[PDB]
Backbone:
């Protein structure tokens, strides 16, 4: 993670190095320091799951009323997964 | 380096074997040096040949 | 001839790791002096011999035609006492051609040899055979060294000889230079039977240079393809000054310049 | 969706394949077996679209992709070396062949850091293949294959340049990673044990034509005298 | 009879062996395998006498062979490729190195011609290793392995990196050829079949000294974190 | 001057170094050859530039001094009718140096180039990248054709320029000739400062010819160690005498011969 | 087999049992009529068996009555097999 700035979400497979490390850091650091914009490349992942979307549902309540939001180049596989839980209708994607 | 790079040491003593015959000899102490005054020479060159009875004996210093 | 000897001390200078193969070059007939036409032995003979026959004829036309116009322009500029092949075949057979011959043999075929030997250590022979203890010197030096040095000093002189044999072909086609006056002029200009006979010796020394330089770098190469191109770079550096040191000394002593 | 029908290939003067076929669907994990040096690499080139076959068709959803690139056709593979330049950084190595199809430096900037978290090499983007170990180089090469989300990812002897002892560790690792990936997979390897545990269907080439067509359990039992001698007990 | 006691060697600045030992009988398969830079072929050079060991003794029938030569002590070995002369013909492969080690005119004249016919190499005498296949080269290699009848015999990865078919053939073939003697054999190799069916004792050298010591059944059960991951269930 | 066109047709007579991959070179021209300071440019200028820096300063000086020994022997034999640089710089800049300079690029750098591409076809780049479909011509040949005419033909003039720099070094050591009279006497005889600055065009076409032949042998090799070493021996067969087509064509115009 | 006299070898299928059968076949056919094309080559064998012991005894009965017989060039392991039959005391070796 650099100083773009961007949210910290799990981009790929949930495993040992990102299950609790990135989850707690999103709630403690990214929410507190307000890095709400997120450009993320999700081409390495085939499809997501409930827990990866659950993080975005926490951001759903926060980002709209604080900052702007712009994604770049979302692959068409992840358009089907993210839209299914109504995150593409309210957030930029 | 007694191995691979020893040879560089050894050839340093044969590199200067054309040092004695690199310029002269020397042999200037067995020759002759003489001087003369000239008033007007057409074509004086450094190291121009000097002769005696048709035989070169030396050159202009 | 002291300044000439002063400049001609390059024959000692370029000997880096080469000198380790001292007794290695000695013991190549230790374990039974083989001889004959073999698979790689003949391919080295193609590189030194058969292919070079075409190089010699065509590079002789490149040199010959350039110095053929020079021959004409000397008549125009200097005069009739040094015209045509009076003062061109004089310098061409004697002192000029020999340098290019060494670059197209000691340089070209020497490095080519090295390149093949390097790959024995990396893949085909020495890789398995040194480890066992099958005589290393007999393995790669003895059957490849001799292949590239027997016809080599004859060929070095033939390079220059063909510039004279083909020089009268194009002396006639550019102008009309009589073949017999070119021939008898040539002989008298260099005093052939005493000076050019000794230039054969100068070219044997050039063959003898190939026996020191080419062998060691193939013998202990790094078995990677970049290490092989570094080894060929080293042979260009070694052979480029060893030849020039003798171009000073033996032009003054064998030829008598 | 790659449709293969009656594929025949003559590699210069050497005839390789007499009309062959297969049923490898989108996401299906299969393997293709045969002796080393029988055009197994050149088969994978036909499926990609690099070489031109004599007879038969290789279509991408019923389309001829001669004028389209491989990056726009969503194809790729994992190589014996890993396709990493040695004079460039890991960042640059995997950025080199993905310039075509959606050129974007900011897209790449996010991609490289994120996709290497799956192998645990996030902070290696400034290093070179010489500095890294053999295993790490293969792990970066794995991430390279899934850079642009291709449908086809072929496997041409991934660990050919590694030692047998080193391969043993990495084969156990890659076994679960291929199943987690779950894309159109074609395994080519000289090790049989590798393919038995992973692949669903195996296509065994017997003298220049696919004869063995079935599962590991169905081909345990042997399709032909050739196959009987191909895999000994 | 080969006996090695506390052999240690530092190859320049890189430590290769920290006191190791073994006991291998005449004409048995030897092999050291592991990651690159652990001395797979260094032991072979130390026993052969190409590299100079730092500490320890290498004995041939209880005799110090540090100062003895290859011909004097009758040493030799078979190489992974086959230990054949690539430029020379099959006839010349076994006629060239029989001049050294017991030079004799009747040895050269009689044995060389007849031993090739006893294997089945009569029609390949004028062919070269480049022209022949790997299986045909193995037949010449097996004939060369016991051509001189060395007192000290080593091997080097008999069938580690072979073709799918060839590996299967050589697993049974070379085993049955060494079964005539069937003596104390020590193999360190990736191949489980090899170390199970042929080898009696296993002495895995890794990171300096011996890490694994015992039979296949005793080393089923693990020796290190590396071995735990390397071996599968 | 009938030897202007006769030198050209020697190169034309046999073109098998370019022909087999000429269609690929034409495709680069079609698709528009690349330019820019890239990583390919760095290693191309290593082989051409960096390596040659020490070769030209050291061997290039003594090559010139051997040709200055020839110059000196004329002073000893003829003297006054070919004094100072009448017959020394005349053939050196215009006729002699150019061929030897070509052997350091058509020969040495060409061999290195061959070695690199052949090995990347077997390993680092094109082994994987052809199969990926990152256009091979655009990837490694297209910017290095452009690189060939950047430093390489200037270096041929610098090589020759060192001969003149060496001429005044030993003007006194061979005899005792004041450097300023040697050089300004030379200058006047061949109109040195005007012609040598104008003659920087001679070898630009040669740079292109060096890279059209050498790239083929690396590019279309069989990537095995036997096929690659055969192609390196084939590089010097075709690159050595196909780079001298425009000698008198631009010597007459730019060097003012 | 050329007429040097070279050893009788099997021209077809190569095997230990096939060569030992060929030795007994050549004994009945060729050696019965006073001819011994046999230079006993044991270099490619590692250890003898019952068949190698059997033919050593049969050769002793056959050839010595008419002429000599070549036992040249044997390895140490098959030399002990010859010494097991005790041919060294009274037969060419």
Residues:
């Amino acid at each position: 993670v650099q100083y773009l700035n961007q949210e910290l979400v799990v981009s790929g497979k949930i495993d040992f190095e990102n299950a609790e490390q990135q989850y707690q850091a999103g709630l403690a650091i990214i929410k507190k320091q307000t890095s709400f914009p997120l450009i993320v490349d999700l081409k390495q992942l085939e499809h997501g799951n409930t827990l990866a979307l659950a993080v975005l549902v926490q951001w759903l309540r926060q980002t709209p009323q604080k900052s702007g939001l712009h994604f770049k180049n979302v692959p068409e596989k992840m358009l089907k997964i993210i839209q299914a839980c109504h995150l593409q209708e309210d957030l930029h994607l | 380096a007694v191995g691979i790079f020893v040879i560089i040491f050894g050839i340093a003593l044969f590199f200067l074997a054309m040092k004695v015959s690199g310029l002269v000899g020397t042999n200037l102490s067995d020759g002759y040096t003489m001087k003369a005054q000239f008033d007007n020479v057409n074509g004086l060159k450094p190291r121009a040949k000097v002769t005696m009875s048709g035989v070169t004996i030396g050159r202009v210093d | 001839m002291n300044t000439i000897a002063w400049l001609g001390r390059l024959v000692i200078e370029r000997i880096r790791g080469i000198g380790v193969a001292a007794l290695m070059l000695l013991q190549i007939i230790f374990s039974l002096p083989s001889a004959g036409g073999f698979g790689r032995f003949v391919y080295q003979m193609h590189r030194v011999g058969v292919m070079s026959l075409l190089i010699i004829t065509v590079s002789g036309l490149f040199i010959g035609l350039v110095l053929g116009l020079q021959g004409y322009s000397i008549l125009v500029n200097v005069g009739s006492e040094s015209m045509l092949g009076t003062m061109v075949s004089l310098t061409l057979l004697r002192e000029l051609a020999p340098v290019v011959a060494a670059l197209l043999f000691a340089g070209r075929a020497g490095s080519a040899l090295t390149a093949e030997i390097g790959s024995m250590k990396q893949s085909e022979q020495l890789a398995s055979m040194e480890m066992i203890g099958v005589d290393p010197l007999k393995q790669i030096v003895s059957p490849r060294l001799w292949a590239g040095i027997v016809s080599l000093p004859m060929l070095t002189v033939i390079f220059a000889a063909i510039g004279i044999v083909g020089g009268k072909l194009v002396g006639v086609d550019f102008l009309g230079v009589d073949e017999g006056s070119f021939w008898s002029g040539m002989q008298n200009n260099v005093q052939f039977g005493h000076d050019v006979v000794n230039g054969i010796i100068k070219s044997i020394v050039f063959a003898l240079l190939c026996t020191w330089i080419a062998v060691f770098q193939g013998y202990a190469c790094d078995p990677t393809p970049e290490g092989i191109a570094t080894a060929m770079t080293r042979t260009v550096v070694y052979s480029s000054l060893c030849v020039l040191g003798f171009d000073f000394v033996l032009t003054a002593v064998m030829f008598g310049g | 969706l790659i449709e293969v029908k009656n594929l025949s290939f003559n590699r210069g003067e050497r005839v390789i394949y007499d009309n062959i076929s297969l049923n490898i669907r989108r996401g299906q994990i299969t393997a293709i077996m045969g002796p080393s040096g029988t055009g197994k690499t050149t088969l994978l080139r036909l499926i990609g679209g690099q070489l031109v076959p004599d007879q038969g068709e290789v279509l991408l959803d019923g389309k001829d992709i001669a004028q389209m690139s491989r990056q726009r056709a969503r194809m790729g593979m994992l190589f014996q070396s890993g396709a990493l330049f040695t004079d460039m950084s890991v960042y640059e190595n995997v950025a080199f062949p993905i310039r075509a199809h959606t050129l974007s430096e900011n897209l790449i900037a996010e991609l490289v850091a994120l996709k290497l978290e799956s192998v645990g090499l996030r902070g290696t983007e400034q290093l070179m293949p010489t500095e890294l170990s053999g295993g790490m180089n293969r792990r970066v090469a794995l991430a390279r294959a899934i850079a642009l989300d291709p449908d086809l990812i072929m496997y041409d002897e991934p660990f050919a340049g590694q030692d047998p002892i080193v391969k043993g560790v990495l084969t156990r690792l890659i076994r679960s990673l291929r199943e987690a990936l779950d894309l159109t997979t074609i395994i080519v390897s000289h090790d049989v044990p590798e393919t038995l545990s992973i692949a669903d269907y195996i296509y065994v080439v017997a003298e220049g034509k696919i004869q063995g067509e079935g599962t590991p359990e169905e081909l345990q039992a042997y399709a032909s005298p050739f196959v009987k001698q191909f895999l000994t007990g």
Residues 164-181 of chain D form the longest helix (18 residues).
